[PDB]
Amino acid sequence: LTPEQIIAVDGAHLWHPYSSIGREAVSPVVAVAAHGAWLTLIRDGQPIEVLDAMSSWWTAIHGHGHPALDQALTTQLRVMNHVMFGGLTHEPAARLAKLLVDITPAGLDTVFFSDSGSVSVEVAAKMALQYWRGRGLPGKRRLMTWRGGYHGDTFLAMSICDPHGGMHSLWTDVLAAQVFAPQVPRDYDPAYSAAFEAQLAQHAGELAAVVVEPVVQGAGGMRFHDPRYLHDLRDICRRYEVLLIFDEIATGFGRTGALFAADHAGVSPDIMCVGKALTGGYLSLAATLCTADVAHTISAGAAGALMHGPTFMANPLACAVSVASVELLLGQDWRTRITELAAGLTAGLDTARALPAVTDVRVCGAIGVIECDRPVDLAVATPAALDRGVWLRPFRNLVYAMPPYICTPAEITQITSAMVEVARLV
Amino acid sequence: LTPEQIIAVDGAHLWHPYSSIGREAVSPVVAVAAHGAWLTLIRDGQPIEVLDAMSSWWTAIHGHGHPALDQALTTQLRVMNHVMFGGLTHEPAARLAKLLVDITPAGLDTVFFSDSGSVSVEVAAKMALQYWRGRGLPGKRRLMTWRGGYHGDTFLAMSICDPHGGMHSLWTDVLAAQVFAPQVPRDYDPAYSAAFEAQLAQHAGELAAVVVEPVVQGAGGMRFHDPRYLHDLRDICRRYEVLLIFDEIATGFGRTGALFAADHAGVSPDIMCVGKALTGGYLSLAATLCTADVAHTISAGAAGALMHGPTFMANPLACAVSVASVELLLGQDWRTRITELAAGLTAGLDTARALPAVTDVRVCGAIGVIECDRPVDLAVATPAALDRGVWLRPFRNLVYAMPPYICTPAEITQITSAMVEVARLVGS
Numbered sequence: 001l002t003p004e005q006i007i008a009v010d011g012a013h014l015w016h017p018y019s020s021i022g023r024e025a026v027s028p029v030v031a032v033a034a035h036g037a038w039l040t041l042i043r044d045g046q047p048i049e050v051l052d053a054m055s056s057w058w059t060a061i062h063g064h065g066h067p068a069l070d071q072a073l074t075t076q077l078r079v080m081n082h083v084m085f086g087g088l089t090h091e092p093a094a095r096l097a098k099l100l101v102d103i104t105p106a107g108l109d110t111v112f113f114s115d116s117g118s119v120s121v122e123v124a125a126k127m128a129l130q131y132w133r134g135r136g137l138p139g140k141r142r143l144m145t146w147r148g149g150y151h152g153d154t155f156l157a158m159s160i161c162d163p164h165g166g167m168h169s170l171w172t173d174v175l176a177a178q179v180f181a182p183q184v185p186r187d188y189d190p191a192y193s194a195a196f197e198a199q200l201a202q203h204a205g206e207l208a209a210v211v212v213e214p215v216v217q218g219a220g221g222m223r224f225h226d227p228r229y230l231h232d233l234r235d236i237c238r239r240y241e242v243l244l245i246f247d248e249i250a251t252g253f254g255r256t257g258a259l260f261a262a263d264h265a266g267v268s269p270d271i272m273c274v275g276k277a278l279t280g281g282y283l284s285l286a287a288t289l290c291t292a293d294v295a296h297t298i299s300a301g302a303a304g305a306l307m308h309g310p311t312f313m314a315n316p317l318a319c320a321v322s323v324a325s326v327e328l329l330l331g332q333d334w335r336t337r338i339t340e341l342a343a344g345l346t347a348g349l350d351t352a353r354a355l356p357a358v359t360d361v362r363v364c365g366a367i368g369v370i371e372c373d374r375p376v377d378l379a380v381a382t383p384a385a386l387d388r389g390v391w392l393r394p395f396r397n398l399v400y401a402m403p404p405y406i407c408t409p410a411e412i413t414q415i416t417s418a419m420v421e422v423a424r425l426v
Numbered sequence: 427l428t429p430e431q432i433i434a435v436d437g438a439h440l441w442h443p444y445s446s447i448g449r450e451a452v453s454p455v456v457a458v459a460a461h462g463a464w465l466t467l468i469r470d471g472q473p474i475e476v477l478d479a480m481s482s483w484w485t486a487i488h489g490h491g492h493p494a495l496d497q498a499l500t501t502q503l504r505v506m507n508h509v510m511f512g513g514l515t516h517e518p519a520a521r522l523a524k525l526l527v528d529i530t531p532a533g534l535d536t537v538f539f540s541d542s543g544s545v546s547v548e549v550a551a552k553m554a555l556q557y558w559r560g561r562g563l564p565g566k567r568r569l570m571t572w573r574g575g576y577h578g579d580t581f582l583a584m585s586i587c588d589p590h591g592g593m594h595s596l597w598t599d600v601l602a603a604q605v606f607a608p609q610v611p612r613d614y615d616p617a618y619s620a621a622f623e624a625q626l627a628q629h630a631g632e633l634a635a636v637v638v639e640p641v642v643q644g645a646g647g648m649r650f651h652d653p654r655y656l657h658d659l660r661d662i663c664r665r666y667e668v669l670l671i672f673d674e675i676a677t678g679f680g681r682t683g684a685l686f687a688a689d690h691a692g693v694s695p696d697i698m699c700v701g702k703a704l705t706g707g708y709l710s711l712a713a714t715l716c717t718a719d720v721a722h723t724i725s726a727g728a729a730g731a732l733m734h735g736p737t738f739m740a741n742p743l744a745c746a747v748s749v750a751s752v753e754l755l756l757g758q759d760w761r762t763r764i765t766e767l768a769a770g771l772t773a774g775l776d777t778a779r780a781l782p783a784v785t786d787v788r789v790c791g792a793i794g795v796i797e798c799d800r801p802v803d804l805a806v807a808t809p810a811a812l813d814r815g816v817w818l819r820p821f822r823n824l825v826y827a828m829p830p831y832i833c834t835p836a837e838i839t840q841i842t843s844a845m846v847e848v849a850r851l852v853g854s
C-alpha cells in the first residue's frame with residue numbers, strides 16, 4: 001500500500017483513539033518508519049524525519065528499534081512465540097516477575113500479567129474487592145480517588161477517571177458511582193489531606209481501595225502534586241483499613257525521575273499497576289502487583305482464586321522484550337540521564353513562562369509541560385511542530401513532551417523550541 | 427534460569443489464570459520451546475515433545491514458529507516497532523483493516539483495534555451504548571444474552587458471562603444486571619426462538635444489544651447450537667431495533683468450519699469481536715468491527731467520537747503478524763483443511779461414546795469434545811495425556827481439543843487417542 005492508499009483505507013475503515021469515522025478534521029499522518037528517537041512521516045508525499053517528543057504515548061523510553069530490544073525479541077521468536085499460561089510457565093515470565101518484584105516499592109511480591117493498562121486496573125480492583133470478601137466484608141466494594149485522574153477506558157476504569165476528562169455526563173448512568181475527592185493541589189497543604197481523610201472516614205465501611213496516579217496525573221491534564229500527599233494516603237489507608245492502589249502505568253520505569261513515582265514518597269501501595277513503558281514501547285503488556293497479604297487473603301477466601309485469566313497472559317515475546325527493556329534501564333545510570341533530560345527541559349521551556357498565552361511551565365523528570373490560557377488549535381500546532389522536525393500532540397490547553405531517554409541535548413533543545421513556538425502561536 | 431529455578435520463582439511470584447498463590451494443587455509445567463504443532467515441556471527434569479492439542483488456548487492456528495509469521499514479524503521490526511495511533515496511521519493497520527473488512531460478514535466496514543478480547547467486548551458495548559445515545563434513546567443501555575456464554579474477565583464483559591456456570595458467579599451483586607434468556611439448545615427448536623423474542627419484547631426499550639457467541643459457546647462449556655438460531659436472532663433484533671453483537675473471539679478464522687461462525691447462517695451482526703487466532707497466536711491483539719451506520723451515528727452524536735483509545739492501539743508489530751496469519755489462511759484451501767481435521771476428530775473420538783463416564787461426544791470443525799459425567803481431575807488427566815505425547819487441558823467435566831490446522835492426520839489421531847485414554851481414566 002502507498003501512502004495515498006493508506007489514507008483512503010484509513011479514512012473509510014479505521015477508528016483512531018477518541019475519534020470519528022467520516023468527520024475528523026485531522027486527517028492522520030502516515031508513519032512509514034521509526035528508529036531511535038525519530039519517526040519517519042509523510043508530509044506532502046515526502047518522507048520527513050521528526051522527533052517523537054511524546055515517546056509514542058509514553059511507550060518508547062529507549063527509543064524505537066533499540067538493537068538490544070530488537071535482539072531480545074528475535075531471540076525469543078526462535079525458541080517459543082507463546083504458550084498458554086494455564087498449566088504452564090516459562091523463563092520470560094519468571095525472569096520478568098523476579099525483576100519486577102525486586103525493583104518495585106517493597107512488599108510487592110506477586111505479579112499478575114495482562115495485555116493492557118486498563119485490564120491491569122480492572123484486575124487491581126478485582127484483587128481489592130476479592131480481598132475484602134476474603135475478610136468477610138463484602139460491603140467494602142466502592143473505590144475512592146481524587147479528581148484529575150485517568151485510569152483507562154474499560155467500564156470499571158472509566159468510573160475512577162475524572163468526571164469531566166472522562167465525560168461522565170454522556171455516561172449517566174451506566175458507570176459505577178465512586179467516591180471523588182477534590183483535585184489534589186500542586187503544592188503541599190496538610191488541610192487537603194485532612195479533608196481527604198474525613199471524606200474517606202465516612203465512606204470507610206463501603207470502600208475497598210483508594211486508587212490514584214502517584215506524583216503525575218497524565219492523560220487527565222499533566223498535573224504534578226507533592227509526593228508528600230502519597231505518604232498521607234498510605235497513612236490514611238492504613239488507619240482506616242482501605243487498600244491503596246498506585247496506578248503507575250504512565251509514571252513507572254524512571255519517567256518522573258525515580259524508578260517508580262512512589263519512590264519519591266518512600267511509600268508502598270498494596271496493589272500496583274504498570275504498563276506503557278514496560279516493553280520499551282514494542283508490544284502491549286501490563287502487570288498488576290500486590291503484597292503477600294493481599295495474595296494470601298484472596299487465596300484463602302471463599303472463592304479460593306483470583307477469577308481472571310487473559311488469553312495471552314504472560315506472552316513470552318512481550319515478556320522477553322520487557323526483560324531486556326528493564327535490564328537496559330537498570331544497566332545504565334538512568335537517574336543521571338533523567339536529571340539531565342529534566343534540566344534540558346527546564347532550560348529549553350524557560351522562555352515560554354513570559355509568553356502572554358502561558359499560565360504555567362512545569363517539569364518533572366523527563367516530562368515538560370507548557371500550560372496555556374486557551375485551547376491549543378491542532379490545525380495550527382501540528383504542522384508548526386513538523387516544520388521544526390518535531391512530532392507533538394497537544395490536547396486542550398497543554399503543549400507537552402515525554403521524550404525518549406536517549407534524546408541528546410541537541411534533541412531536547414529542538415523539542416523545547418518547537419514547544420515554545422507552538423505556545424507563541426496560541 | 428534452570429527449569430527448577432523457574433518453578434521456584436513461579437511458585438513465589440507468579441499468578442496464573444483463575445488460580446491461587448501458594449495453594450496450587452498442581453505445579454505448572456515448564457515450557458522451553460514451541461515449534462509447529464509441538465511444545466517442548468520439562469517432565470522430571472527431561473525435555474519432551476508433546477502436541478499442542480489446545481492450540482495454546484485457541485490461538486496457534488498455524489502452529490508455532492511458522493516461517494511466514496516469524497518473517498512478517500522480523501520484517502516489521504526492522505522498519506517500525508510501534509507508533510502512537512493518535513494523529514498517525516500506518517500500513518500494517520490499513521492492510522489489516524482492509525482484510526478484516528473484506529472477509530467478515532457483509533456490512534462490517536469499520537475497525538477498532540485493541541489489545542485483548544475482553545477489551546474488544548467493552549468497546550462493542552460502548553459502541554452500542556453510544557449508538558443509541560446518538561439516536562436520542564439513552565434508555566437503551568442494557569444487554570441481553572443467552573445462558574452458557576463467556577465474553578471476558580473485565581467487569582462489563584463479566585456481566586454477560588453465564589451467571590451460574592459460570593466463573594463470574596460470586597460478583598453478581600456488583601455487576602450490571604443484564605437480561606438472560608435460557609441456555610440455547612443444541613437442536614433447533616422454534617419454541618426457544620419464540621420465547622427469546624417474547625422475553626426481548628418486554629425489554630426492547632432498555633436494550634442496547636443482544637450479545638452472543640455464534641454457533642459455539644467456548645469457555646462456558648464447549649456447547650454447539652444450530653445456526654438457524656442466529657437467523658432468528660438477526661430477524662428479532664431487526665424487528666425490535668436492538669443491535670446484534672457477535673463475539674467471534676473464540677470462533678473466528680476457520681475454527682468452526684466456516685471462516686466466521688456467523689457464516690454458517692449467512693448472518694451479519696451490527697457489531698463483531700475477533701481476538702484469539704487473529705495474530706496466529708503470536709501476540710495479543712483484538713478487533714471490534716461495526717457497520718458504517720453504527721459508526722456514522724456514533725460520529726454525529728454528542729461526543730462526536732467513540733470514547734476509547736488504548737495505548738498500543740493498532741500496534742504495527744501485532745497488526746503485521748495478523749496480516750500474515752490471515753493471508754496464510756486465505757492463500758490455502760482452509761475449508762478442505764478444516765473439514766479433514768473434523769473428520770479425523772470424529773473418527774478418532776467415536777470410541778469414547780461407549781466409555782462408562784462419557785455422556786456426549788461432539789465435533790464442530792476443528793473442535794472436539796468428550797463430555798464426561800463428572801468433573802475431570804487435572805492431577806490425573808494432565809500426566810495421562812503427557813504420557814501419550816499430548817498437551818491437554820480439561821476444564822470442569824470436558825476433555826476437549828482445538829488443534830492447530832497444520833496437524834497431520836496421524837497427529838490428530840494421536841490427539842484423539844490421548845483424549846479417549848483420559849476419558850477412560852475418568853471412568854476408573
Ligand SMILES: *Cc1c(COP(=O)(O)O)cnc(C)c1O
Binds near residue numbers: 119121152213248275
Ligand atoms: C494509559 C493509562 C491506562 C490505560 O492503559 P491502556 O494500555 O491504554 O489501556 C491506565 N492508567 C494510566 C495512569 C495510564 O496512563
Ligand SMILES: *Cc1c(COP(=O)(O)O)cnc(C)c1O
Binds near residue numbers: 542702
Ligand atoms: C477468550 C475470550 C474472550 C476474552 O479474551 P481475552 O483476550 O482473554 O480477554 C472474550 N470472548 C470470547 C468468546 C472468548 O473466547
Ligand SMILES: CC(=O)Nc1ccc2c(c1)C=CC2=O
Binds near residue numbers: 738739
Ligand atoms: C485523545 C485522548 O483522550 N487520549 C489519547 C490520545 C492519544 C492516544 C491515546 C489516547 C492512546 C494512544 C494514543 O496515541
